[PDB]
C-alpha cells in the first residue's frame, strides 16, 4: 500500500502515525 491510513490491514506498518501530511495531502489533497 502507498500507506493509504496503513490502520487499513497493514496496522504495523504504520511510520508517521497519521501520514496525511506525508501521503494524503500529496497524493489525494493536492498542494
Known amino acids: 500500500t ?3 491510513t496503513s490502520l487499513h490491514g ?3 506498518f504504520g ?3 497519521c501520514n ?3 501521503f494524503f495531502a500529496t497524493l489525494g ?3
Do not use: N
Open 2 to 4: 502507498t500507506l493509504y
Open 15 to 17: 511510520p508517521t502515525g
Open 20 to 22: 496525511l501530511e506525508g
Open 10 to 12: 497493514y496496522f504495523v
Open 29 to 31: 489533497g493536492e498542494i
